[PDB]
Design a protein around this nucleic acid. Structure first.
Lengths: 475, 54, 108, 54
DNA sequence: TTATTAATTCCATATGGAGACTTGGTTCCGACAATATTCAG
DNA sequence: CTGAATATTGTCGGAACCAAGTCTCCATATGGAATTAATAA
C-alpha cells in the first residue's frame, strides 16, 4: 500500500481532530496558493417549498441523477398517492424536499465520488425539486465555471473529506467549507471564460443532438421482429398482464414429458398460442441441435493470475460476445481445451433473473487468447444450413426468446432462474426460409451498428470537454 | 405487505381485500362518543369564556 | 417403512405423502409448497402421486417477496382434495389398461 | 484472503508474507520420504517382474 | 457355442441450490436545539 | 415580582447498513461406460 508518515501536529488541522488515512493522505505540506470557500461559492441553508396541490410537479433522488449530471426527474401529482410511490410522498411530507434557486450547483452528500454534481442553469423552465441530500452551493464566479472546475478537476479533494464512519461514504457541508482550491485553476479558467463556455456549449449541444436520436440496445431487436412478423406491440404486453390462466387435467400432458403443472408453464403455453396465430414457420429446435455443452466454472479471483473466465454480464441483447473477461482462474481440469470459446460458437445463458435468462450470443470477435466459459453458459452447435446462428441469438434476445424463457425456465430460487437442455430441445421457434433470414439480421445489424457508432461520439465529446478543461486549467 | 430488515410496509394486496366498513356498527355508541367529545370541548369553551369574562 | 417414496433422498416431499395418510377421502389440503415441486423433473414422481390420490383443484403463484428478508424462495399455494376409495381404483384400472396397451405397442 | 459462504480464497498479501522456507527442517528426514518414493516404485516393479517371467 | 442382453460397477456431464455477491443511496432512530413551559420562594 | 427553568417539539447526524439488481460455484445423481456373469446358440 503506502508508507505515509505524518507528524502529530497535522491532526490539529480541521475542527474534528480526525486522523483517518484518507484525510491525512490529502493534507500534505503546501507552498502554493490557498483560497477558501469565501471567494468562490457559498452554502445555502435548506428550506421547505410551497408545493401546489393541483399540478404535477417533479422530484429527484440521488439515483435519479447520473455521473454526467443529467437529472431524470419523476412526475408526482398528490392526486395519485399510490402505494408504489407512497414512500416518495411520505418523505416529501417529512420535509426532505427543496427547490433550487436557478444558478446553484447541487452536490450529493452520500458517496461524492460518483460525480453527482448537477447544474441548475439560469435560463431554463420546468422547475424540479430535490432531496435534502443535495447541497445548494450557489456560486459567485459564474455557475458554469465552478461546475466545470468541480466535475473533472477538484475531485481528488472533495472525495478526500468524506466520512466513512462504519457505513456510508458521506460528504458534509462543514467539511465542504474547508477545501483549499488553488487560484491558478480559477484564475486561468476565468481568464479563458469568454471562449471556454462557448466551445463547451457547442460540445454539449452536439452531445444533446446525439442523445436525441439514441435508442436502446433492446428495442431495436424488439421492433424488427415486431415489424417483420406482423405482430402488434400493444397486446402481447397486455395479454401478459392478465393473470387468470385456467387449464384442464388433459392439457397437462400435452408436450410435457415431465408432467409440469406450474402456473408459469401454463401461461407460456397460452402466450405461444398467441405469438404463432399468423406465423407459419414454426419448427422444433430439437431436430436442428447437434450437441450441447455447459462449460467450466472453477473458483475465480477478480483481476488475478490465470486463464480468464467470462460471466453472465458479457452476454448482451445483440448476439455478440462482449469478450471482456474480469475473473481469472488458476485451476486445471485435464480437459481445459474443451472450453476455450473460439470464434463462431453460440452461447445461450443458463442461470439469471426471470427476464435475463435465455439471452444467446455469437462469438464474432477474433481472440487468440483462450478464454473459458462458465457452467452458466450452454454451447449450442446447430446445423449451419437452416438456422443461421446469429438469427437464432437475435430471436433468443427478442420477445420470442423472452416471453418463453420467462415462463418455462425452472428453479425454486427465481433470482437465479435456470434453463435446461429439455427446454432447448422442446422449443418451437418460428424458422422462416433462409431467404427471409439474413434480412431481419442485417437490418438489425446496421441499426445496432449505427447506435454503437453514436455511442462513442457521445463519449468523445464528453471526453473532449474534460480534456479541454484540463488543458485550459493547466496553461 | 413488504417486510424488510427495518420493518413492514403496505403494498396493494392482490390476494384479498379488507372489509374496511364493518357490516355491523354500534351507531348509537359512535353518536354518543361524538356527543361526549363535543360536550367536553363545549365545557372547555364555557370555562374559558367565564375566565375571559372575569 | 411407511412412505412409498421413503428412499428418494428428497425428504421434504414426504410431508405431501404424509398428507395422504391424514386426510379422510375428501379432505381439503392447502399447502405452501416451493415451485421445485411444480417445475423440476426430479420431483415428477411426487407430481404423479398428487395426480393419482389427490384431485388438484387450485394453484396460486406467490411472489418472491412473501418470505423476505428471510428467503427469496418462490412459493405456490396448492389446494387439492383427496379422491374417494372408488376414484383411486378407477385410476388404477385405467392406468393398468393403458399400460397394457403401451406394452403391446412397444413390443410391436 | 477472500472469504465467502463457500470457503476462503487466496489474495495477495499486503500486511506480511510467509517465509515458506522452514529453515529448521533436518534434511535426511525428508530424504527418507524421497528414497521411499523410489523404493516403493521399484518394489512394485519387482513385484510385477516376478510374475512377468511366470 | 458364441454369442447374448440384462445385469452390474465407475467418471464426466447435467441439473439444481431454505443462494450469494455487488454496486450505490435509501429509511430512521436518536440526540438535541429550541423551545417551553414556568412557579417559587 | 426577574428568572433561565424543563418540556416538549422538529430536525441535523449517522448507521459491525442493506434494499435493488443481478451474477455463481459447487454437491450429487446419472447414466453410461465400463464391466460382469449370463444367455442363447
Amino acid at each position: 500500500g503506502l508508507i505515509q508518515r505524518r507528524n502529530f501536529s497535522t491532526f490539529a488541522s480541521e475542527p474534528s481532530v480526525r486522523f483517518d488515512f484518507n484525510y491525512m493522505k490529502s493534507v500534505t505540506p503546501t507552498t502554493e496558493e490557498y483560497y477558501t470557500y469565501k471567494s468562490l461559492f457559498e452554502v445555502v441553508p435548506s428550506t421547505v417549498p410551497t408545493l401546489d396541490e393541483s399540478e404535477p410537479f417533479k422530484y429527484a433522488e440521488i439515483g435519479h441523477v447520473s455521473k454526467n449530471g443529467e437529472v431524470f426527474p419523476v412526475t408526482l401529482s398528490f392526486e395519485d398517492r399510490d402505494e408504489l410511490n407512497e414512500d416518495l410522498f411520505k418523505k416529501i411530507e417529512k420535509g426532505d424536499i427543496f427547490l433550487p434557486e436557478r444558478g446553484n450547483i447541487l452536490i450529493s452528500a452520500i458517496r461524492p465520488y460518483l460525480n453527482k454534481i448537477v447544474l441548475i442553469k439560469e435560463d431554463d423552465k420546468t422547475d424540479i425539486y430535490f432531496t435534502k441530500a443535495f447541497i445548494q452551493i450557489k456560486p459567485l464566479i459564474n455557475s458554469r465555471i465552478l461546475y466545470y472546475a468541480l466535475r473533472t478537476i477538484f475531485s481528488e479533494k472533495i472525495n478526500a473529506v468524506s466520512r466513512q464512519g462504519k457505513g456510508y461514504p458521506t460528504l458534509k457541508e462543514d467539511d465542504l467549507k474547508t477545501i483549499q482550491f488553488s487560484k491558478k485553476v480559477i484564475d486561468n479558467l476565468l481568464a479563458k471564460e469568454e471562449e471556454l463556455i462557448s466551445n463547451i456549449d457547442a460540445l454539449e449541444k452536439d452531445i444533446k443532438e446525439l442523445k436525441s436520436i439514441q435508442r436502446s440496445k433492446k428495442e431495436i431487436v424488439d421492433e424488427v421482429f415486431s415489424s417483420h412478423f406482423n405482430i402488434n406491440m400493444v397486446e402481447l404486453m397486455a395479454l401478459d398482464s392478465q393473470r387468470r390462466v385456467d387449464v384442464g387435467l388433459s392439457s397437462i400432458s400435452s408436450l410435457n414429458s415431465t408432467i409440469r403443472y406450474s402456473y408459469r408453464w401454463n401461461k407460456m403455453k397460452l402466450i405461444q398460442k398467441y405469438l404463432y396465430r399468423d406465423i407459419d414457420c414454426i419448427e422444433p429446435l430439437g431436430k436442428y441441435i447437434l450437441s450441447s455443452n455447459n462449460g467450466w466454472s472453477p473458483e475465480s479471483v477478480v483481476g488475478g493470475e490465470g486463464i480468464p473466465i467470462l460471466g453472465q454480464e458479457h452476454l448482451e441483447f445483440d448476439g455478440v460476445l462482449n469478450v471482456s473477461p474480469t475473473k481469472a482462474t488458476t485451476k486445471t481440469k485435464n480437459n481445459m481445451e474443451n472450453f476455450f470459446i473460439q470464434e463462431g460458437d453460440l452461447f445461450i445463458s443458463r442461470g439469471n433473473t426471470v427476464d435475463l435468462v435465455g439471452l444467446a450470443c455469437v462469438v464474432e470477435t477474433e481472440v487468440t487468447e483462450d478464454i473459458i466459459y462458465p457452467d452458466l453458459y450452454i454451447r449450442l452447435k446447430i446445423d449451419e444450413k437452416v438456422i443461421h446462428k446469429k438469427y437464432l441469438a437475435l430471436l433468443f434476445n427478442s420477445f420470442f426468446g423472452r416471453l418463453y424463457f420467462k415462463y418455462v425456465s425452472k428453479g425454486k430460487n427465481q433470482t437465479m432462474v435456470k434453463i435446461s437442455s429439455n427446454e432447448l430441445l422442446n422449443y418451437y421457434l418460428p424458422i422462416p426460409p433462409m431467404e427471409e433470414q439474413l434480412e431481419i439480421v442485417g437490418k438489425i445489424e446496421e441499426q445496432i451498428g449505427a447506435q454503437n457508432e453514436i455511442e462513442k461520439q457521445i463519449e468523445e465529446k464528453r471526453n473532449q470537454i474534460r480534456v479541454i478543461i484540463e488543458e485550459t486549467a493547466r496553461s | 405487505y413488504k417486510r424488510t430488515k427495518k420493518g413492514e410496509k403496505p403494498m396493494p394486496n392482490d390476494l384479498y381485500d379488507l372489509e374496511y366498513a364493518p357490516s355491523t356498527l354500534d351507531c348509537e355508541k359512535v353518536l354518543s362518543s361524538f356527543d361526549i367529545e363535543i360536550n367536553a370541548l363545549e365545557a372547555s369553551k364555557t370555562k374559558l369564556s367565564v375566565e375571559k369574562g372575569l | 417403512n411407511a412412505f412409498l417414496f421413503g428412499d428418494k433422498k428428497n425428504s421434504e416431499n414426504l410431508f405431501i405423502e404424509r398428507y395422504y395418510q391424514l386426510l379422510k377421502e375428501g379432505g381439503r389440503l392447502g399447502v405452501v409448497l416451493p415451485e421445485s415441486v411444480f417445475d423440476t423433473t426430479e420431483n415428477k414422481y411426487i407430481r404423479l402421486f398428487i395426480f393419482k390420490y389427490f384431485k388438484v383443484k387450485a394453484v396460486v403463484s406467490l411472489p418472491q417477496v412473501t418470505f423476505e428478508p428471510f428467503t427469496s424462495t418462490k412459493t405456490s399455494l396448492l389446494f387439492a382434495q383427496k379422491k374417494t376409495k372408488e376414484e383411486v381404483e378407477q385410476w388404477n384400472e385405467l392406468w393398468d389398461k393403458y399400460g397394457k396397451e403401451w406394452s403391446l405397442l412397444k413390443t410391436r
